[PDB]
Design a protein around this ligand. Structure first.
Ligand SMILES: O=P(O)(O)Oc1ccc2cc(C(P(=O)(O)O)P(=O)(O)O)ccc2c1
Ligand SMILES: O=P(O)(O)Oc1ccc2cc(C(P(=O)(O)O)P(=O)(O)O)ccc2c1
Ligand SMILES: O=P(O)(O)Oc1ccc2cc(C(P(=O)(O)O)P(=O)(O)O)ccc2c1
Ligand SMILES: O=P(O)(O)Oc1ccc2cc(C(P(=O)(O)O)P(=O)(O)O)ccc2c1
Lengths: 349, 349, 348, 351
């Protein structure tokens, strides 16, 4: 094969430097990039009207929490609307984030679409005009991006088509980001839905991540200028067999060691529906796993950072500080967890 | 693998019936889907201002040419703008086309974009929201679509990445079309640029089309409900070796026989920069090639149907009939050519 | 990609000419390449000892049937042992075959082996030293070869690995054959075992054959110098739903039309465990199917040509003529069937 | 996809334990598996007749070198013939190797064959009957195997076909070995021939290794029970641009970090035509490279361990001790090199 380099040394340095800042020791990501339809559910859960101002205020509440979160938060993923909103003091939210030591991220996918001829499987759209969007987002303060693909474990899923196509579109997204100075977070989420056990999740995760990294290679992606946002390896939500956090950690770290090249700068786990505590305990067990882990293992959490804060807020401005305190408590917990410092046989894998 | 049928028998019948109508014996396609920027080059060549009204009048001139074209024209590919324009008598252009026995087609890609890490290679964008666009276009009178991928022959091209990715995006586009009752024309154009010879073009065409049909299989595409729009197999533009039309025909038909399943309903060749006469003579020779050809071999021509008509028009309303006459003459010529009736060893392939 | 031609025009002409001779109109293939272990079961079924001489005599019985078979038999696939055996008159069996207008073929695979990490799936071995073996078989009178891959329909099979790997090894085998003047018959057999229905067999057959032809493209195989030996598309053995021969034919031809490039010179169906009559009726229906079929559709039959002959023989020399007559009858039947002359769609 | 496990936990433990023993800190591999035709060239260069006894004597000279080599040699790759030969005292050579702390390996490929339709590219044969051969070799004392694929950098090579096919056959070989308790060393050698530069070798090495590990995944290979034997990343032999050992090290380690999952137990470099000292200096620089390296980085050397010993021997029995001393000296040097402790005394964004 013949090299026509995708990136200059200067471009590589920029991307690697950004990626490393996001996942520096003790740091993880606040995933605050819920679309309006997704944040509508959460505001509904606290009897709060889904208005642009309430969304602004709620995002403000998280982003302006006090300086205790600064060493915990290496990056914040925003939804488009929020990237262009301002705090009460008039500061653009990206400036707020940066002033606290955080890197600003932007979700750029345009959601899932059905794959015809599959058993309810999807790919993800959003490539059209993405290069121009990335150039604009970079000018407007974002240095990394997020794109979510979704796979499901079932009798006939994930299919060969779903694995190949989601890996391929992730690679296209990553390529476009890197041409524009944006670090792509590659998110091939395997949902926990179903009654499958831990070893089945581990098996599917291994196959998916092998496909992801082959596609990234085929598309000439610079891995040092990327992050990976995978599911932890867990039993299915409905699995009747029970597992310890140490078993979840061993399956997760084993799957990653078998598939993720050491050049990848970091792994920022999604927590899906895990409780706030569950997500911290699992991340902590992952970091205590006694296998060699050549990448940062940290968090990219939404509900696992926000659930208690949202409830404490309750849509009432006078609950601001109480709500922020709940978020700080989870930021501190997960900052400890991504160092193996949180307290509330590998051949079998 | 497990079947979760992409299409019902009723959906398949609709797509197969449309595809067969377009390429019925003696019929081919007027490719009139030049974007505003693309048609600008045309109108500039005749000192005509690139306004919507001038574009409307020119498209009208072609679409309302007299009834002699009806048995020649099985389909017309339109650009979005034109699908929603009307002739002077108030008739929507899709109604004009249908009243003359033509199927209405719509170009749906959003142009090429660069593949990072390649020697100037591209893929094509346009999948975002494509399902909704197809449903709307179907409602508004279109029954087939076009999507153009572009590959180039050079020292290191087409690369494995470019072949793989362009084949994959063609398959996604085809899948989405078929879910919405739209027959996709799959266009993997290999440009004739360069100094390569006929056998190099044949080799690359064979490899590209094998990749295209494997991707269509992987994505569960119903081939009977598709058409193929390939390059003919020709020497490169800068090649100094001379070849006969019979050699071009043999290389073209051999390449297609080696790659295109008989289930594909028809092949509608692009002619690129070929002269009007060259494109007709080549197509005629292709149809006279003594090898077995289990698909229709016809035309999807732009300049090869329009060049003399555009010149005779000159932007002047009073040249209407003179311009229409030149177009009619080429429609008649190519209708004969796609039957092997136009007049102005295989182991070596 | 860059062309470094696998084959010269002269090499291509040789392979295309051989391939076309084998499947010329009215002609099919006698598949007589059973391993000794497979033919043992057969000789036992007629109380005949599985000796070298009894195998020789049985193969002689088929190969020296009278000249009525000549327009029926375009090729005969032999097992190694038989390629080097002689008829009673001293003629090598390849000379016997050629003297009757047949092309001689040689089975070259060395059987299936298990794919670790699968649910009982296999690939096929036999590439080692294959080039030198082909060169020798060519000198010894063979002009085509056969290699059998085996796939199974089940809840999780055929797996992506099994499809990928069997397609790849077929392509390697085909490539080596073509370098040595041998036409490869590519046999990706999907077993009929199981209770799946006709559309499931059609779906799997379509996916397998697409993978096969992509692998053949990747390995620079000259399709005009090949033949395909697939399963017909049928319900599984244990399927309770019943289908007509016209439905089997439509599914089979549709699957082939969706995957087999017109450049492939011919399709020579295996019949497996189908009765002699069933195999003829199905092949006839395939050829009467009213879709366009740009390749020869004929037979590569073993038991469907041999079953009644084996019975009439019974291991007894005095039944030679009676046994040969049964074989001739099936050769004639299948010669008619591969022309659509034998008498005893959007839903696809 | 559905798991029908290729290996039990016990089988995995056996393979992982073997793999780790071979590449334990300070240890590398003596690659002594030259076929009869290949060793003929070596013996002629010292005017010695290529007889079975001379081959036995030469292999004995290496395998019975004194105990200084024991902490240096974690594994020895043998050719079939040698696996069944005995030392002068009657001990089978596998017992000799084991008694000195080494794991016994067996080369199981049957050589390269040409890929039709390529510019002189090859794949490698040897799968036929390989399972039975592996079971027999395991019984007869071998615990790991070697299989060599060869790729070339040129105008149109390595081609997509060559990359795909060599990766696939390596995966088949690895699968069969692991079913029989044999650790497969996966060797996708990219030859150094040609005038390409360092960044071109790095690029091709990255693409080849990504294909290798995708194939191993597709074939359900247990990476912890494997080793990798790649080329170092170097300029081509005819390249006119000069590079430092630190640049070679950086390019090599970067390429591996970008493709080799951390689960792989170790990387045992081939040295090709590098001189004895060059192969040690480069391996040492690789181990001093200031990037994170989550696998052992050690040697699987033939000529780089044998060249001076072969010369000092000269086919003369009376030169035995002198010849063994030269081998010991290279074993000691490379044991230091694979720890980054070798001395002659005894920007990464640019990649
Ligand atoms: O609304 P969409 O446009 O589809 O975008 C999404 C989709 C899923 C998300 C999940 C999270 C968290 P969760 O709160 O734990 O679910 P996770 O850590 O990434 O899983 C956060 C933000 C998300 C945004
Ligand atoms: O402007 P774009 O949006 O990119 O869309 C295009 C691009 C190329 C085209 C080529 C043709 C003819 P040609 O006039 O002979 O070149 P062909 O037969 O398809 O080659 C016709 C219409 C085209 C429209
Ligand atoms: O013993 P092996 O070495 O594995 O080789 C084989 C395997 C299957 C065979 C099947 C047939 C006939 P069948 O008698 O109808 O089954 P088919 O027409 O090819 O199916 C003929 C010869 C065969 C030889
Ligand atoms: O003769 P074959 O059957 O083909 O088997 C081979 C081929 C190449 C070899 C190279 C080496 C050394 P080298 O002596 O340095 O070349 P490397 O370190 O593995 O390169 C050692 C043993 C070899 C054996």
């Amino acid at each position: 094969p013949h090299s026509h380099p995708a990136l200059t040394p200067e471009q590589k340095k920029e991307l690697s430097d950004i990626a490393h800042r996001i996942v520096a020791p003790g740091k993880g990501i606040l995933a605050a990039d819920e679309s309006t339809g997704s944040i509508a559910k959460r505001l509904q859960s606290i009897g709060t009207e889904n208005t642009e101002e309430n969304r602004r205020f709620y995002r403000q509440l998280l982003l302006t929490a006090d300086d205790r979160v600064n060493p915990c938060i290496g990056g914040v993923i925003l939804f488009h609307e929020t990237l262009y909103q301002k705090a009460d003091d008039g500061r653009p939210f990206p400036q707020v984030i940066k002033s606290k030591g955080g890197v600003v991220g932007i979700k750029v996918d345009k959601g899932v679409v059905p794959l015809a001829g599959t058993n309810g499987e999807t790919t993800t759209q959003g490539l059209d005009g993405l290069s121009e969007r990335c150039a604009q987002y970079k000018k407007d303060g974002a240095d990394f991006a997020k794109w979510r693909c979704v796979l499901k474990i079932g009798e006939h899923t994930p299919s060969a088509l779903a694995i190949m196509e989601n890996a391929n579109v992730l690679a296209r997204y990553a390529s476009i980001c890197q041409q524009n100075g944006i670090v792509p977070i590659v998110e091939p989420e395997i949902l926990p839905d179903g009654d499958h056990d831990l070893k089945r999740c581990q098996y599917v995760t291994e196959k998916v991540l092998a496909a992801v990294y082959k596609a990234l290679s085929d598309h000439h992606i610079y891995l040092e200028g990327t992050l990976l946002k995978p599911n932890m390896v867990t039993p299915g939500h409905a699995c009747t067999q029970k597992y310890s956090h140490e078993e979840i950690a061993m399956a997760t770290v084993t799957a990653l060691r078998r598939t993720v090249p050491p050049a990848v700068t970091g792994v920022t786990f999604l927590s899906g529906g895990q409780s706030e505590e569950e997500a911290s305990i699992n991340l902590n067990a992952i970091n205590k796993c006694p296998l060699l882990k050549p990448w940062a293992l940290t968090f990219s959490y939404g509900r696992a950072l926000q659930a208690s804060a949202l409830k404490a807020w309750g849509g009432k401005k006078e609950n601001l500080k109480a709500a922020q305190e709940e978020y700080v408590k989870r930021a501190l917990a997960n900052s400890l967890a991504c160092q193996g410092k949180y307290t509330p046989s590998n051949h079998a894998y």
